[PDB]
Amino acid sequence: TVNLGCKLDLKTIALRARNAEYNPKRFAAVIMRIREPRTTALIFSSGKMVCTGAKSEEQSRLAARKYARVVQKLGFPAKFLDFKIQNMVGSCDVKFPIRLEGLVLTHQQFSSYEPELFPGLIYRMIKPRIVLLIFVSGKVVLTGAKVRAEIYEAFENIYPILKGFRK
DNA sequence: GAGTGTTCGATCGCGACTGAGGACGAACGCGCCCCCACCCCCTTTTATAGGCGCCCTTC
């Protein structure tokens, strides 16, 4: 997310934009998209914006910066004030099946799973405060990160354990 | 002689006295609607897997 440093009129923005959507009856912000960034932006009336879809923090920064220019180019005093990363998402495959029953048993304090709920096991690591999603096929997803290393780190801690839980 | 005026007794009207009944109200009572307070609710992307609804076709 980033602040454009000014209050804006989304109605005008929606009107001007060639590739954005807005509906106050659905949400108070303009939804804008770009084919170059392929993430989508959320333009609050407050001037706050959200960048999504980006594969990297820079690309998020690049798109958000790219988003901030055109809003300015609409006629607004947009800025790049207070830019920050809000979330990062990662994924990987351990390439081997594991006995979740043992895993949810041995790490109930952190690991969490319910086959009646969702097919993926939810691991909430606190070390670097990371959440992992662990699936019967061995696929894993990590999110809630603001640092890429934490995904690598959270995964470095969890993979050996998983190997120790090989079927 | 005779006629008129006054007062206690007696007689009658009055109101006081006591209770019950009817109507009224005020304290008590009931509940809704008002509002502030506290905190959820909505959206996207990216990844995944289980369950699943609807349609198309065939019976």
Swiss-Prot record:
Binding site for DNA: R33, K48, N87, R124
Entry comment describing in which tissues the protein is expressed: Widely expressed, with levels highest in the testis and ovary.
Transmembrane annotation, as ranges: none
Annotated GO CC locations: chromatin; cytosol; euchromatin; female germ cell nucleus; female pronucleus; male germ cell nucleus; male pronucleus; nucleoplasm
Sequence repeat start and end residues: 1-71, 85-162
Location in the cell: Nucleus
GO terms of molecular function: aryl hydrocarbon receptor binding; core promoter sequence-specific DNA binding; DNA-binding transcription factor binding; enzyme binding; RNA polymerase I core promoter sequence-specific DNA binding; RNA polymerase II cis-regulatory region sequence-specific DNA binding; RNA polymerase II core promoter sequence-specific DNA binding; RNA polymerase II general transcription initiation factor activity
BP GO terms, sorted: DNA-templated transcription initiation; mRNA transcription by RNA polymerase II; positive regulation of transcription initiation by RNA polymerase II; RNA polymerase II preinitiation complex assembly; spermatogenesis; transcription by RNA polymerase II; transcription by RNA polymerase III; transcription initiation at RNA polymerase II promoter
Keywords assigned: Disease variant, DNA-binding, Host-virus interaction, Neurodegeneration, Nucleus, Repeat, Spinocerebellar ataxia, Transcription, Transcription regulation
Role this protein plays: The TFIID basal transcription factor complex plays a major role in the initiation of RNA polymerase II (Pol II)-dependent transcription. TFIID recognizes and binds promoters with or without a TATA box via its subunit TBP, a TATA-box-binding protein, and promotes assembly of the pre-initiation complex (PIC). The TFIID complex consists of TBP and TBP-associated factors (TAFs), including TAF1, TAF2, TAF3, TAF4, TAF5, TAF6, TAF7, TAF8, TAF9, TAF10, TAF11, TAF12 and TAF13. The TFIID complex structure can be divided into 3 modules TFIID-A, TFIID-B, and TFIID-C.
Family: Belongs to the TBP family.
Disease per record: Spinocerebellar ataxia 17: Spinocerebellar ataxia is a clinically and genetically heterogeneous group of cerebellar disorders. Patients show progressive incoordination of gait and often poor coordination of hands, speech and eye movements, due to degeneration of the cerebellum with variable involvement of the brainstem and spinal cord. SCA17 is an autosomal dominant cerebellar ataxia (ADCA) characterized by widespread cerebral and cerebellar atrophy, dementia and extrapyramidal signs. The molecular defect in SCA17 is the expansion of a CAG repeat in the coding region of TBP.
Description of how the protein assembles with itself and partners: Binds DNA as monomer. Component of the TFIID basal transcription factor complex, composed of TATA-box-binding protein TBP, and a number of TBP-associated factors (TAFs), including TAF1, TAF2, TAF3, TAF4, TAF5, TAF6, TAF7, TAF8, TAF9, TAF10, TAF11, TAF12 and TAF13. Part of a TFIID-containing RNA polymerase II pre-initiation complex that is composed of TBP and at least GTF2A1, GTF2A2, GTF2E1, GTF2E2, GTF2F1, GTF2H2, GTF2H3, GTF2H4, GTF2H5, GTF2B, TCEA1, ERCC2, ERCC3, TAF1, TAF2, TAF3, TAF4, TAF5, TAF6, TAF7, TAF8, TAF9, TAF10, TAF11, TAF12 and TAF13.
Protein name from the UniProt record: TATA-box-binding protein
Annotated organism of origin: Homo sapiens
